RNA sequence: AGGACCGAACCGACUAAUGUUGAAAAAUUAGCGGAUGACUUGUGGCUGGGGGUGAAAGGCCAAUCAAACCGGGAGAUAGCU
RNA sequence: GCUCGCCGGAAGACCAAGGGUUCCUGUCCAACGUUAAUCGGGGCAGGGUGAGUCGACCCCUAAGGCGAGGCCGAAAGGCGUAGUCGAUGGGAAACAGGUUAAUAUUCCUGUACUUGGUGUUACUGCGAAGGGGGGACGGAGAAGGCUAUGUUGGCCGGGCGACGGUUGUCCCGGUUUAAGCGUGUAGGCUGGUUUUCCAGGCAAAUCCGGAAAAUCAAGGCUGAGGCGUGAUGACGAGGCACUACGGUGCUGAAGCAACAAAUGCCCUGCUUCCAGGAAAAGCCUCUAAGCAUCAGGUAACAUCAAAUCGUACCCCAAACCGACACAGGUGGUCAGGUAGAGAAUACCAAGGCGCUUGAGAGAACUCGGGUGAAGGAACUAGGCAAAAUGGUGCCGUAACUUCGGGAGAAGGCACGCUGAUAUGUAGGUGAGGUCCCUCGCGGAUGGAGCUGAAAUCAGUCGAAGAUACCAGCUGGCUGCAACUGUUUAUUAAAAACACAGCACUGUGCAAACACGAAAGUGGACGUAUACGGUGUGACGCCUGCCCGGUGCCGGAAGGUUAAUU
């Protein structure tokens, strides 16, 4: 059956990846939060 | 000319089609078309703003001159079109200088028809003038609202409107509404009814015609549960409230015209 | 031209292998590890210079290195370019 | 010609049996409906939570829906166990 | 290794997406692998991905995103102009053969092609952010011409048979060759040329559009395939030297024809229909400002350049999505034989597999199947399930009907094989040859050869000839819904939703209405034959009475009545 993750690269840098958060004040703070907790991958790029 | 389908399918029985002979079979005259992508009506917020549109057949768009403010020059007609954005017939006019341009089609215009603007073109179908230079009782469409604006009224298949009397600055017009509206006489107007008056005969047959057209369909509010719908609800079929839009304003008679900036100019509402 | 210090810098190693040894004796062509920069003028002109000899012609891929482990930990060997340098 | 007919691919999901600590958190097998269309499908895009979207079932919105998920107010409050 | 079995519109092959070394080699068997494991997609080490031409990047745009200024908004921000991004679309060019343990249109061999720079030479109006052309487009259908491909014959090589027969009307195998370049054919489209003039193409134009003459009527464009060359080459059944028994090395015959034939190509065509079918650049052409014995353009020749990144491997799957080496899910491409309408189905080819516990036994019972005396729905909530029907041709076919239907109604008959008609017919194809002949990819006339149904008559085997697989059960009465559709992903597919049609009602355009503190945006580049809302739900015959209540619409005398004063 299908399930509900069908990867694709395009779509996820698109939604999640660093330059989309970058680009409005709440992904700059999903980045903030994430240095914060001092996370090894601050994104899906 | 208005033909009925056989009823070959069940989905043919009832259609009737609106088909025209004089309509160009070939393409489009390709300097006069643009692209016009479809909305699904949605807004640049991307939510749906006017329900039941979606899909339908892509459509290029035709540039029409409504203005039709290039005067003096004769055009003859070249050949009549099949428009998909609107319901008249669009015809390609070719001036004396060499430019070619859309029009509306008016009744009875044909291939090799002369038409002129201006306010010393003839009264003749198809001729465009100020409404102070065409005859009180005329048939007119096309009307422009303001002067150089356009026309605006009287554009759809078979419609047309009457210059009732002429006062001073303005005109009094007969609108197909039954409206009787005052507009400035230096407004243009071409003479003659729009063509293509069969095309209210057309019976579209069965739902996919609807659908061919980029209508969606309609859901009742009273299919529906009350979180959709002030209609919605009951065990069975119930009602019990006065009809309304989904947005729950009385839509059986509730009138909803509110523009003081414009009532001046309603000498009598269509009633 | 290109200067001396980047070709210098442009080719790190012979690459010792069976297809290489079978790429010179067949194909006269000498199999290089070069910079992951390096580009086919510079590692054409780098050979001919510091090898003294005469390039037909530079083809050039890069290895992904591979992931490798080191206990319980992971970690990956780094990308590297190679050269199959055809000599004249 | 056709929201035409029979019928594979393709899209569905009417019946039955099996399975029900499954081969599978919805399937398999035998049959079943549509199959040029209001069809189907790839890629990308847009709509965001009292909000969307809905040929309308309160359906669907990441195995979650009569108000998603995550974090926070937060040790809500609990005359109850 | 031999045999057996299974898939073969796949369980083969090639990819995209996704994964990321899983690829190849050596080595190891703790753990992982539902068992053992010497094996592995496992551990460890080493190796492996080669591009001007494939793809990305790149140029160009779609939806859409972002968006200098701007407009708007307590702040955050929203919207949007110029722009700038954004493929799933448009845009230059490479093929065959050989080769690695593992890459190959990338390496090698052979033979090509493209774009750009630079220089030289000859000749020349060049010049854009501007104009025009082009690019550039739908559905369906039909037929012709083809090719891929297959079959058969010929040809060449080999064979003479484990058991009756097999020197033949016998058996087996092979019979392949590209891009490019040249040629210009079946076909498709279009009248051609010159001169003059011009309220159009924001200015200009020699271009495009328009007008008017004259002249010639056959010029142009487009185009599969074929043919030639590429190729005196390559490949090649097999054979012969060596064998690390894995394979290397050498050599090499024929290499034609006929017929059949795509869903591929001509064809972005043609015909037809209505629902009327991207954009922008590359490209072509025109000029502007400007530059002028210069730049720049065109052509030839030479030369240089074409970077960078991807390239292994899996890819209907043990490598992706499903926690698993999971009966699930996953887009594109390729398409052999016999039978067949077929991409169904059966059996096979190429190719790939036997699904990572086995061994016995032959109880109940469960599961999946086969057959069943007599009966035949008595079963049961219900014929649930099962059984049955099932093909083609022909005959024949009721009520009712909106005249289409109902209908494959129902029901019935024929059906294999052999021979003859006819050593193979009707039909298709079409050579030699002979004519005409612009003179060839040409007619015309021939019918050699090839292919080839269908029928009739006669015979003949079986219980049975649509023999398997495959493949409608049928009819009668009636409720509901007109119909095709849609729906509760995962217990409801329906009478529910939708629907064409109908009506009421709003809406005069800065429309009503909707999203939005707003700007705006949708409605619509629409304009009352339009658009929104509501109810009803094809069609037919119709749709009665009630305005007291509650809405809505209209009115405004009078009563009452806010801020305010
Ligand atoms: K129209
Ligand atoms: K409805
Ligand atoms: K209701
Ligand atoms: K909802
Ligand atoms: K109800
Ligand atoms: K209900
Ligand atoms: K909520
Ligand atoms: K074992
Ligand atoms: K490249
Ligand atoms: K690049
Ligand atoms: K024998
Ligand atoms: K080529
Ligand atoms: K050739
Ligand atoms: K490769
Ligand atoms: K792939
Ligand atoms: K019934
Ligand atoms: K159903
Ligand atoms: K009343
Ligand atoms: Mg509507
Ligand atoms: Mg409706
Ligand atoms: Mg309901
Ligand atoms: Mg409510
Ligand atoms: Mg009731
Ligand atoms: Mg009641
Ligand atoms: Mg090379
Ligand atoms: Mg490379
Ligand atoms: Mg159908
Ligand atoms: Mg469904
Ligand atoms: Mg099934
Ligand atoms: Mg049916
Ligand atoms: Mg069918
Ligand atoms: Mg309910
Ligand atoms: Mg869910
Ligand atoms: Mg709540
Ligand atoms: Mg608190
Ligand atoms: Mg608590
Ligand atoms: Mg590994
Ligand atoms: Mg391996
Ligand atoms: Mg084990
Ligand atoms: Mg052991
Ligand atoms: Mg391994
Ligand atoms: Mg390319
Ligand atoms: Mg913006
Ligand atoms: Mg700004
Ligand atoms: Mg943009
Ligand atoms: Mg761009
Ligand atoms: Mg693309
Ligand atoms: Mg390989
Ligand atoms: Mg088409
Ligand atoms: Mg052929
Ligand atoms: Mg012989
Ligand atoms: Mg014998
Ligand atoms: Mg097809
Ligand atoms: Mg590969
Ligand atoms: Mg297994
Ligand atoms: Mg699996
Ligand atoms: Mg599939
Ligand atoms: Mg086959
Ligand atoms: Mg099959
Ligand atoms: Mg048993
Ligand atoms: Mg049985
Ligand atoms: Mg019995
Ligand atoms: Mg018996
Ligand atoms: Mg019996
Ligand atoms: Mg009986
Ligand atoms: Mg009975
Ligand atoms: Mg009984
Ligand atoms: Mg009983
Ligand atoms: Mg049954
Ligand atoms: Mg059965
Ligand atoms: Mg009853
Ligand atoms: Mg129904
Ligand atoms: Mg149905
Ligand atoms: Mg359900
Ligand atoms: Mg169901
Ligand atoms: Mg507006
Ligand atoms: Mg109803």
């Given at each position: 059956m299908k399930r509900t993750f069908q990867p694709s690269v395009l779509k996820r840098n698109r939604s999640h990846g660093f330059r989309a958060r970058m680009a409005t004040k709440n992904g700059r703070q999903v980045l903030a939060r994430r240095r914060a907790k001092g996370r090894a991958r601050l994104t899906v790029s | 000319a208005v033909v009925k389908c056989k009823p070959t399918s069940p989905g043919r029985r009832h259609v009737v089609k609106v088909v025209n002979p004089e309509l160009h079979k070939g393409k489009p005259f390709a300097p006069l078309l643009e692209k016009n992508s479809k909305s699904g009506g949605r807004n640049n917020n991307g939510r749906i703003t006017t329900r039941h549109i979606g899909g339908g057949h892509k459509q290029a768009y035709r540039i029409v001159d409504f203005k039709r403010n290039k005067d003096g020059i004769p055009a003859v007609v070249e050949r009549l079109e099949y428009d998909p954005n609107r319901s008249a017939n669009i015809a390609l006019v070719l001036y004396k200088d060499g430019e070619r341009r859309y029009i509306?089609?008016?009744?009875?215009?044909?291939?090799?028809?002369?038409?002129?603007?201006?306010?010393?073109?003839?009264?003749?179908?198809?001729?465009?003038?100020?409404?102070?230079?065409?005859?009180?009782?005329?048939?007119?469409?096309?009307?422009?609202?303001?002067?150089?604006?356009?026309?605006?009224?009287?554009?759809?298949?078979?419609?047309?409107?009457?210059?009732?009397?002429?006062?001073?600055?303005?005109?009094?017009?007969?609108?197909?509404?039954?409206?009787?509206?005052?507009?400035?006489?230096?407004?243009?107007?071409?003479?003659?009814?729009?063509?293509?008056?069969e095309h209210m005969l057309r019976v579209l047959g069965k739902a996919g015609a609807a659908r061919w057209r980029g209508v969606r369909p309609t859901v009742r509010g009273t299919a529906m549960n009350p979180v959709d719908h002030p209609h919605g609800g009951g065990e069975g079929r119930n009602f019990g409230k006065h009809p309304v839009t989904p947005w729950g304003v009385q839509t059986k008679g509730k009138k909803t015209r509110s523009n003081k900036r414009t009532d001046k100019f309603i000498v009598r509402r269509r009633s | 031209m290109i200067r001396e210090e980047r070709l210098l810098k442009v080719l790190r190693a012979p690459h010792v292998s069976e297809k290489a040894s079978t790429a010179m004796e067949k194909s006269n062509t000498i199999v290089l590890k070069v910079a992951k920069d390096?580009?086919?003028?510079?590692?054409?002109?780098?050979?001919?210079?510091?090898?003294?000899?005469?390039?037909?012609?530079?083809?050039?891929?890069?290895?992904?290195?591979?992931?490798?482990?080191?206990?319980?930990r992971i970690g990956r060997r780094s990308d590297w370019k190679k050269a199959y340098v055809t000599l004249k």
């Open positions: - | 509306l089609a008016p009744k009875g215009l044909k291939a090799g028809d002369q038409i002129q603007s201006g306010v010393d073109a003839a009264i003749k179908p198809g001729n465009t003038l100020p409404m102070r230079n065409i005859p009180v009782g005329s048939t007119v469409h096309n009307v422009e609202m303001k002067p150089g604006k356009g026309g605006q009224l009287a554009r759809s298949a078979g419609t047309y409107v009457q210059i009732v009397a002429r006062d001073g600055a303005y005109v009094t017009l007969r609108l197909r509404s039954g409206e009787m509206r005052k507009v400035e006489a230096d407004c243009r107007a071409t003479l003659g009814e729009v063509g293509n008056a | 390096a580009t086919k003028a510079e590692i054409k002109a780098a050979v001919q210079k510091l090898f003294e000899v005469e390039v037909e012609v530079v083809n050039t891929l890069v290895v992904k290195g591979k992931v490798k482990r080191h206990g319980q």
